[PDB]
């Protein structure tokens, strides 16, 4: 039960809108990463899936507590990619480009005194530095071993 | 083990695209019905969203098994609605189109001979006109009763 500040609002449908688009993407990517063979990646990516499904609970939680209704920009084209270091670069994409806008309305929020949203948040953010963390990591072993001696390691003994 | 038709994985990837804003969409308003307290609504559509993502699977499914790969049109906006009723006409209108996709595409993989495609959009399309009767039906009460009226019978003794 409380009015919450109209940019805030504005802010949380934009990262609702940036969770959708990621559980789609890690769904699709998940689902042809098993089907090659590469059971790690699959399980992790089905693994945030799940994340990114919670955060999307805390912030529909939070716009409708604000008085506010879940109402998306668009959500635009999904980049899936063609091979596996394009899917996970394109994951990381979409991770940094929400990292930056969380932490852009966690600024927001501090200011105008909102903190249990800014709180909210920033317990996602540490979730989306650790999915940064991982692409990134992933994308590092790419670049050092090659693409294809990179996948042949995923094959298990 | 086969090269598919160009044609069919172009509407396989169409019609995944139409699952995955539906399970978005649906997400979303199931969420909203059960914070007004409309038990009924949520269930149905958390229901129908588990049909739309087991849908989707199929897709993917058939995709890779033509030796294509996920690759999306763009998603666009998702009009979430602001009531109940504007809610379930968005849904309907997300019906009816991703009905006539489908319908198209069952014409198409028929004339070329691909059956096996067409008959598992065949059982796909069989689902959607159960989700597209749900959602007429209580439109057509919400007319008849008025929304409010409507709303007030949705609670629980």
């Given at each position: 039960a409380m009015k919450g500040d109209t940019k805030?609002?504005?802010?949380l449908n934009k990262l609702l809108g940036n969770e959708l688009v990621a559980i789609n993407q890690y769904f699709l990517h998940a689902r042809m990463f098993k089907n090659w063979g590469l059971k790690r990646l699959n399980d992790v990516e089905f693994r945030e899936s799940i994340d990114e499904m919670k955060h999307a609970d805390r912030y529909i939680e939070r716009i409708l507590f604000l008085e506010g209704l879940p109402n998306l920009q668009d959500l635009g084209k999904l980049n899936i990619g063609e091979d596996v270091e394009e899917?996970?670069?394109?994951?990381l994409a979409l991770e940094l480009d929400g990292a930056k806008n969380l932490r852009?309305?966690?600024?927001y929020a501090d200011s105008v005194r909102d903190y249990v949203s800014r709180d909210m948040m920033i317990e996602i953010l540490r979730d989306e530095?650790?999915?940064i963390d991982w692409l990134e990591t992933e994308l590092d072993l790419i670049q050092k071993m090659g693409l294809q001696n990179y996948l042949q390691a995923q094959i298990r003994e």
């Open positions: 805030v609002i504005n802010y899917m996970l670069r394109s994951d852009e309305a966690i600024g530095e650790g999915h």
